[PDB]
Amino acid sequence: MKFYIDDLPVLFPYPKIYPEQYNYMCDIKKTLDVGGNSILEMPSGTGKTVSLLSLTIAYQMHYPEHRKIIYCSRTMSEIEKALVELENLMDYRTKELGYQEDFRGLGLTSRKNLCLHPEVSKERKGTVVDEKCRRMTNGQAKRKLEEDPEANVELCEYHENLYNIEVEDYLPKGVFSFEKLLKYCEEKTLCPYFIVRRMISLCNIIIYSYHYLLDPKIAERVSNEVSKDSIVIFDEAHNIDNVCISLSLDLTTDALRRATRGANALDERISEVRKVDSQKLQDEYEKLVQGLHSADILTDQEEPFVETPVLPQDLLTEAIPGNIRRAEHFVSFLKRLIEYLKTRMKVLHVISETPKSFLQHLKQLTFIERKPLRFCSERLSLLVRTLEVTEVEDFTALKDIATFATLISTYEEGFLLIIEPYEIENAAVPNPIMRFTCLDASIAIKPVFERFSSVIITSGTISPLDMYPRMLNFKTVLQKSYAMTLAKKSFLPMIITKGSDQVAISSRFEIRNDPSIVRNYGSMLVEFAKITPDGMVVFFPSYLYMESIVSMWQTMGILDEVWKHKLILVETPDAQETSLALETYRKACSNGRGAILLSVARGKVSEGIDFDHQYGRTVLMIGIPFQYTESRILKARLEFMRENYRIRENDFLSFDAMRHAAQCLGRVLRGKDDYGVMVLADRRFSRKRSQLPKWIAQGLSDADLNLSTDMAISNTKQFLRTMAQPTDPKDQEGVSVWSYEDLIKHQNSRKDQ
């Protein structure tokens, strides 16, 4: 389609169109012009992305001013989800209106995904992937490649030939999704990790993890071309908060100890080289004694060893690290650091330290100064940069210290260090956690937020729209909750507060077996497992908590019976096994015989994956999720959060569980073709009807309150049967599917007011 929003042709690629999408686009364009933040509840059961991209692409190509687009995603899954999406929209744009587009946009994800050279592609850990892909094309290693080309130099070899041809202009015109990108770059032998890294400078739409927009050590290279004032899209950013908490930092003393020797390994390295080649190190001192050395304290084409844990290369200063200008001075105080840390390591009990409170306390037990403390990282960065070491795993820990040092040098009074003497789960053992953490998400949010007023945020499960403006203090404009329009059932929600014995079922009671509930839960599950066709998942408040249920159920005769009907797949903590298991679960659902999956709402499964009709027909939320299984980490954070913002733990608590509860459910529907059954299994959900995302609660009927299993099973029994009918009125869909180019013309001409 190609219609108007009172100013713009809308090159809509899907002939059929949904009224909300226009109701959607109508509002965002309004917000698009007059700058704002102004999040939007958008039920992703429709195509929200098309509704987004439709407005955006023209708005970029219709108005002349903003030639760039910023679309930030929760994960590569979202990336690849959107990547194909635009591409076809973009492809539809060439098909229907010739070619006047000259638009290219792509997304950076990592090295590990994008390291195309098979060597580290075999290797697992991204830091090691970072380490060797650095060592592939590293300022020393590329100098090892150029100045002293030797067998010690291995590389992707692409970044050379990429540099040979790529870095003058882009590959021709494609928005090359990984599907297109991974192949296309392989043929011409590219590790596109650098293709995008150079292409940072080009694309007019970008997509990457919020980290790449928020993680300052990766969200550092922000350029005006890539940023200056263009449009910002935060998709499925309901969980943005926890991402900002990025500035997380806990201290594995065991790794820390290895750092000590790594520090000594550094200590030996600097001493041994200062024996051998100290002049350039003195020249580096002369590269230091000049001042900040902005020439190579900041500009390093393939060199930079330590990232910028500080904000995107801003929160620093210029006065030299005084004495530490001498690395031997510098090396020494680093030992003061770790030992201080090592000294602080073995506190008998848990101790929480505010930075400033700790600040002079550092000077107390060892007279160190904060001004050098920030300088460590760059001072470290050049230090290792000068000495082309063979490994970083030791030095990862090292830079983390500097990273810690920088961080603790950096911020205050919104952040805090706490050391539990151990992990109390297996308490009375030595494993103290010198945890220093972020507390306010907004602080890390502020900078990018400070930049551009074309900031837009939307999840399928934002609820309520207040906490985020509350928590982040940020200045929205409009926050409209989108009632999904349905001329039909199209899905089913349910609430099981009590079982057949009307016994309230819960999880807040304990992580344990009140044998009534779980024995009741075996029934609940199994009867559902019987009734539905293939495709069904359940969620649990916590992994080991789930473990209890399974183990006891395994003991009981419950499991085998469901084993008769469906196939069972658990969730694992490791991603590998999971990742394998999932596709199978897909295969069983896709194949005939029924299956079933179990996982945890806080789990990675709930965060990235999606569930269509066959893949998902019924879901189950065993219990109401919670986290005070864990420690003051939240509470201590709550302190600042509660003491500043008029929020109680419950405020955070009751919403955030829901923030994760429905977070699962949004995956259940992909297209308005799909449908499903959405049950809730906890007594407290009854009190919780009033925190849902609007379209959910609208889809939620009253009579479904505190259902037992018996009353529940009937409705699904029908709903399944009913929905399975080719319920195709094909006439009332005019209102709900907006007769194409006509009713949107018609009804919105009638909706002209």
Partner 1 sequence: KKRTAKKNITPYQRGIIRSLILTLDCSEAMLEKDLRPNRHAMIIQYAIDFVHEFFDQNPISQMGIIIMRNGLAQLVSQVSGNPQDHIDALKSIRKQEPKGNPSLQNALEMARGLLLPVPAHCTREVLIVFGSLSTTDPGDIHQTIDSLVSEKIRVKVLGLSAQVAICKELCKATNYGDESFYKILLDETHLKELFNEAVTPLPVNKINKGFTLVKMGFPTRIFEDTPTFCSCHSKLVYGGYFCPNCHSKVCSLPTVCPCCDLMLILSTHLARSYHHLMPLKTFAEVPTTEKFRSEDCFSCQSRFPXXXXXXXXXXXXXSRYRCEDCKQEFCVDCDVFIHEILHNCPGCESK
Name which of 471, 469, 476, 475 is nearest 645 in CA terms.
471
> Judged by CB under 6 A, does residue 116 bind ligand SF4?
yes
Rounded CA-CA distance 53/57 in Å is 6
Strand partners, 707: 496
Count of residues interacting with partner 1 (CB under 8 A): 24
Dihedral over alpha carbons 19, 21, 27, 28 (to 10 degrees): -170
Contact partner, 534, from ligand SF4, partner 1, none, Cβ < 5-8 Å per class = partner 1
Indicate which single residue of 476, 614, 686, 698 sits in contact with partner 1 (rule: CB under 8 A): 614
> Judged by CB under 6 A, does residue 120 bind ligand SF4?
yes
Rounded CA-CA distance 426/300 in Å is 45
Part of the chain binding ligand SF4 (CB under 6 A), chosen from 108-116, 560-568, 615-623, 713-721: 108-116
Query: H-type helices in 292-326, by residue range?
Result: 294-297
Question: Measuring CA to CA, how many Å separate 664 from each of 234, 342, 611, 657?
Answer: 19, 42, 10, 11
Rounded CA-CA distance 610/665 in Å is 9
CB of 595 to partner 1, least distance (A): 9
CB of 308 to ligand SF4, least distance (A): 20
Handedness of CA 170, 175, 179, 180 (dihedral sign): negative
Nearer to ligand SF4, 133 or 434 (CB): 133
Indicate which single residue of 371, 480, 489, 530 sits in contact with partner 1 (rule: CB under 8 A): 530
Nearer to ligand SF4, 66 or 111 (CB): 111
Footprint of partner 1 on residues 533-592 (CB under 8 A)? 533-535, 565-566, 589-592
Nearer to ligand SF4, 190 or 401 (CB): 190
575 Cα distance to chain centroid: 16
Q: What does DSSP assign to residue 498?
A: B
CB of 110 to ligand SF4, least distance (A): 9
Contact partner, 565, from partner 1, ligand SF4, none, Cβ < 5-8 Å per class = partner 1
CB of 707 to partner 1, least distance (A): 20
> Judged by CB under 6 A, does residue 156 bind ligand SF4?
yes
**Which distant-in-sequence residues (6+ apart) come within 8 Å of 199 by Cβ?**
104, 106, 170
Rounded CA-CA distance 639/667 in Å is 33
Helices vs strands, H then E, count in the chain = 32, 18
> Judged by CB under 6 A, does residue 566 bind ligand SF4?
no
> Judged by CB under 8 A, does residue 673 bind partner 1?
no
Strand partners, 420: 433
Please say whether the beta carbons of 82 and 73 come within 8 A.
Answer: yes
Handedness of CA 31, 35, 36, 42 (dihedral sign): positive
Nearer to ligand SF4, 117 or 379 (CB): 117
Indicate which single residue of 371, 488, 613, 689 sits in contact with partner 1 (rule: CB under 8 A): 613
> Judged by CB under 6 A, does residue 108 bind ligand SF4?
no
Footprint of partner 1 on residues 680-739 (CB under 8 A)? 717, 720-726
Q: Which amino acid is at 733?
A: E
Nearer to partner 1, 20 or 674 (CB): 674
> Judged by CB under 6 A, does residue 195 bind ligand SF4?
no
Nearer to ligand SF4, 158 or 611 (CB): 158
Three-class SS of residue 495? coil
Buried b (16+ CB within 10 A) or exposed e, 265-302: bbbebbeebeeeebeebeebbebbeeeebeeebeebeb
Part of the chain binding ligand SF4 (CB under 6 A), chosen from 132-140, 378-386, 551-559, 736-744: 132-140
Q: Which amino acid is at 208?
A: Y
Contact partner, 133, from ligand SF4, partner 1, none, Cβ < 5-8 Å per class = ligand SF4
Handedness of CA 421, 426, 431, 436 (dihedral sign): negative
Nearer to partner 1, 315 or 713 (CB): 713
> Judged by CB under 6 A, does residue 141 bind ligand SF4?
no
122 Cα distance to chain centroid: 24
- Indicate the helix (H) or strand (E) that contains 598: strand 596-600
Indicate which single residue of 193, 305, 411, 528 sits in contact with ligand SF4 (rule: CB under 6 A): 193
Indicate which single residue of 191, 196, 376, 465 sits in contact with ligand SF4 (rule: CB under 6 A): 191
Nearer to partner 1, 150 or 673 (CB): 673
Contact partner, 116, from ligand SF4, partner 1, none, Cβ < 5-8 Å per class = ligand SF4
Strands (E), 300-383: 351-353
Q: Would you put residue 412 in left (φ > 0), alpha (ψ -120 to 50) or beta?
A: beta
CB of 161 to ligand SF4, least distance (A): 11
Count of residues interacting with ligand SF4 (CB under 6 A): 15
Rounded CA-CA distance 395/398 in Å is 4
Binding site for ligand SF4 (CB under 6 A): 111, 114-117, 120, 133, 136-137, 155-156, 158-159, 191, 193
Query: Which spans of this chain sit near partner 1 (rule: CB under 8 A)?
Result: 530-535, 565-566, 589-594, 613-614, 717, 720-726
